[PDB]
Symmetry: C3
Amino acid sequence: HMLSREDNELLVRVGPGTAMGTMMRLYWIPFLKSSEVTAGGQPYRVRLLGEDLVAFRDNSGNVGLVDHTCPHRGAPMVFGRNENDGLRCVYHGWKFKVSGQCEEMPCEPADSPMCKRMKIKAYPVKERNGILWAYMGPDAENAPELPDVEWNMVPEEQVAISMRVQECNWLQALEGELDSAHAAILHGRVGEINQWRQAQDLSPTFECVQHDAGISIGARRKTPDGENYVRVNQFLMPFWTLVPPQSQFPELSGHAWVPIDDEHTLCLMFSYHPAKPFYERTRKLFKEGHNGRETGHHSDNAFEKRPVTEPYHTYWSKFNRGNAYQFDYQSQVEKYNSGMPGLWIQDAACQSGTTPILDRSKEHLGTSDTGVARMRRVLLEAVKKLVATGEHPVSSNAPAAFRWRAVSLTIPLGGDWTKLGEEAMRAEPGKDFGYTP
Amino acid sequence: HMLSREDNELLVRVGPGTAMGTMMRLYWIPFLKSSEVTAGGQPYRVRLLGEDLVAFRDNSGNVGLVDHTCPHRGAPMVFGRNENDGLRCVYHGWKFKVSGQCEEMPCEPADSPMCKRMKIKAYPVKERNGILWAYMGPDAENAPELPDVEWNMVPEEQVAISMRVQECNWLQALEGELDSAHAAILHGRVGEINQWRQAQDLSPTFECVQHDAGISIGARRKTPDGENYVRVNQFLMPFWTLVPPQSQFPELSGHAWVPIDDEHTLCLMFSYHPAKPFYERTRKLFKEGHNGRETGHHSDNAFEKRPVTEPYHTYWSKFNRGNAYQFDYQSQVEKYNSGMPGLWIQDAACQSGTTPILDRSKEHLGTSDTGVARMRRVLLEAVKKLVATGEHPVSSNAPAAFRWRAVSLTIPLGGDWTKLGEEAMRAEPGKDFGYTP
Amino acid sequence: HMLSREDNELLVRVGPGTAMGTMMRLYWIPFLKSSEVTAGGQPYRVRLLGEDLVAFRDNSGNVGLVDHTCPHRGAPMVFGRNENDGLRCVYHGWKFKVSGQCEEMPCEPADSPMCKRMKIKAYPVKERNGILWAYMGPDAENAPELPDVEWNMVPEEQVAISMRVQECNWLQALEGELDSAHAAILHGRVGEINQWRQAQDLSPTFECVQHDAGISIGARRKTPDGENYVRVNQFLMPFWTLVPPQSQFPELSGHAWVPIDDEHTLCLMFSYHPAKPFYERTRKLFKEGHNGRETGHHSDNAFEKRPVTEPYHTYWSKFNRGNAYQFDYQSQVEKYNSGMPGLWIQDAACQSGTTPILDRSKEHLGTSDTGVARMRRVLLEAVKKLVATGEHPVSSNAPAAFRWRAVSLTIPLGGDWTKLGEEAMRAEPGKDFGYTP
Ligand SMILES: N[C@@H](CCC(=O)O)C(=O)O
Ligand SMILES: N[C@@H](CCC(=O)O)C(=O)O
Ligand SMILES: N[C@@H](CCC(=O)O)C(=O)O
Ligand code: FES
Ligand code: FES
Ligand code: FES
Ligand SMILES: [Fe+2]
Ligand SMILES: [Fe+2]
Ligand SMILES: [Fe+2]
């Protein structure tokens, strides 16, 4: 469970040519909402796995993802003209299709073959249920299908999405969602029956079961009746977490914790009902805030302004390191265990720590980190095999391996959740929970 | 035409002791307007070729250029008292003349010889037609006269000047003014006869002729009548560009692209009539803006506020990297090929690229860069000889070599512009264009 | 007197494991006002000698000083809950006493021994006359008593305190207070009898006498009557300066110039009467400003806002590098030798120089720096012995060695101030000056 500086480096470094950056590049990356690029409209800057890029939707409705720098003499592609089914650099007129193929160089002789030989760096994009996905691996023609992540396979009326930039490395943010025991402590109310059933037993015991695409982490608690309440969080490779539903207005939430660069993470959150249209009231509260506080989702109107040249320029929060997440001491005294003004914010402020990259060689884990330690083991084993022998993880070529659900089961004391919950943990089209969360 | 990382380094690095910084130091540097330092008034911070300095005009009207740091115990010289024909550090009273010679140390015994031995680093300044020039080379007593650049030799009523800081390395900005084919593309209007004659032929062919002080770059276009329209841009060592005049209210513009440091450039722009007082209307539009947009010059009231301790503290634009040059997508859609709100801004946003120093080893040149490639050849050859054998460029000791003009000639198809334009490309006191631009 | 780059490095570097950082760690560090942490109230971030920490006062009134980072999984301790005589990280509930001992880990089994073995990095704090002191040395059980610095031993009604962050390395700020000749120059009025008696003789001669805890620096001036006026500034190890009193409303001022990190200094200033309650008018002017200008103390309401996560978040001035200390040229012309709007500000702007760490290998000292040079000699000798042989300075284990006062004596021409001022330079409980300042 104890990590060297070297192990820490293998996990946090995601830039081009790095171990973890190479392994991340074997998977499709969910990187933007469909709505963010309008056909023939403004391009949108992103940065993914350390690389600065520009997405645009052409007039025929197709999205390309290209270098942010023009390959001619280096002008910014975000200032290009998106029209006639291409993005054209305004400096000398080089025009690129969504594929990256250059289509015109107006300043060059018309006989010139330079144009047909020219490509801007570009990555294939797929689009599903309002989400754009990119494949950044070296062999696009050998890319598998999108992963069978249920949240992105249900009709859109069943799902609610948000995204935000968090100012820390991806893995310490991901860990925060495989950490069942934190929630009652960090997110609880001062003083006072209980508020969640997790509040009933503050020290779950842990059991973890590896499968082809990650690990199931069962947090086993005692119930005031001497049954077991098992919350099973799911990790799916390389950067997915699934959160076990609560009692009221039960839904399946989770994130892809997409590394923007070594210091920043795109926190793509989803909340879905597996079988019914999503709760209308919940949807609105995600978007507008709840009792004046952020939910687990980022609300729609609480982002700062950034220029178009910044990556994810519309996803930087008004709650950030530079203002200590608008921490409110008085509310910590009077009402909330933590004075951060919302659910995701409480998570972000803790997990982002006092520097953007956690040094795990300095940490001191307890039993509450059992699941965290086990998930790291999966990552490290995978990345090391990739470095040692060039072997890819099974899950990088197996879309059907992602058909998982987190579950919150009530079972006899000492029960085997892996058997009792076998069916409920299986994702299926339009199948309901199969139990009472 | 293909540059190594190493060649790129030789060109972009301008700090003390570097190859290009050594070669730049062989030439007089135009570095401030006369009006910027009033006799006995406030000193003004500058940084040139990587060095932080303070200019001041003493009570007798003479300008000195000295270290920004007091040589005693390091106090900032910009806070010194400019009076009694010296600048005096307020910490312990050391007073320096424009030459750098220390004149008084009030806290020292009056017998002490330390004072007469003490000099602050200082560089010789010359003043001509409202422009201050500095010589930063190691052997001031062997400095040639100022270069015979016509723009700075005409009476002031014939010339209009602006300066601005651009947040990129000097050479990529200079290149933008030896790049005839860019202009119709970057600076054109959406949709629609034509607007400039350059718009008639979007792919000039290129011919370049080296001379003692740089290179003449002839962009040859076709005319709708089967004559040739040749625009000859001029590069003069080490950092001058001359722009061929347009048809209406023809004038000769250009820049010295003065390296402030490796990441910043002082863009000193001049526009002159060679024989008549400058167009009054043009002058005002440079100063005030044109249809609410910047011209090629920076307007007088569109700079941000900076503290006196910053170099060129009054020349940082309100249009800058941090706000994406106030890019306006709607105007790009409706009216302008590029949505940057002015001529210089369109140039700056493209040429400054996505990082302050362009890596030319990553670029992909075409025929439109013929002149750019040829100018780099001149620079690289010069800097390499200087490194290899210590040989100075001819033009570093030949003021009369700078007597050039850019020209825009109409000539028979296939004509020899070098002969037909021989006289028009020669600068002479009060001589008119000698043709119709 | 001439320092190598290497000597400069030995003096300016104060982080963990460095020479000067090791030697500083042998002494108690005055680091906060008592009033800054209320019992059971908000914790307060500090950084000392390169280390980021959190101070808190528990419900029983005791102060702890702990790592700013939770030793579990790295959450910020400044967001912890200060209650029930501990500070508890909100992420997983780890609770720490003022000693650093962990008291609870709610998420762990109740049998678990991890808790009793766990400590957060913590340092012992002592409290005296409204000042909190920390011991950061490796052997706390062998720490001497607090130093017998009189300013912190008188009843509080005799003393006035301020603190501010200055954006430069500690030693160049400390030097400014062992530099008698600066004051009449930097702090004087334009044109015009005199204003201080230091203004009568602008070039004192210097004599220095080392003692166990530092050096006495006598600046000897001529009086308009042919007597001697000796101002004796005191340096006490490692970072104390004592300022000789003036004529009117004489008081003893000084600072501990506490290194926050290599680039920042906590300027803890004290002004006391040795025998009477402090002048009420003086006290108010320190707090409110004097004729609209800062005194030597920072006024109470001229700090910028910083988030709770910044060290010394309430001590960053509105007069700072980023705004050139609100320098006012017009006032420099009309009224003040230096246009900085106050006494400490004039000091700060000069001594902070043009970069945060002065490179002494580039300086050019004169006789006015005699005391500065001698104080450096004491520091360098001490730090070198510590590195060479592991020997600690005498003064690091001798509280009674700090019982010193600066003095401003009137004595016969050529007198021996060390004998004439022997008694006046001795600090004693409630003893008056023993002369007329
Ligand atoms: N995102 C949820 C996860 C809840 C859980 O792990 O049970 C939180 O931060 O509380
Ligand atoms: N400064 C002018 C140069 C014009 C030319 O090269 O012809 C521009 O940016 O358009
Ligand atoms: N802090 C005082 C010290 C005065 C002295 O050294 O005499 C000043 O800056 O002027
Ligand atoms: S820089 Fe993009 S076309 Fe020339
Ligand atoms: S620092 Fe300039 S005179 Fe002393
Ligand atoms: S990070 Fe502080 S208790 Fe877990
Ligand atoms: Fe949480
Ligand atoms: Fe241009
Ligand atoms: Fe002073």
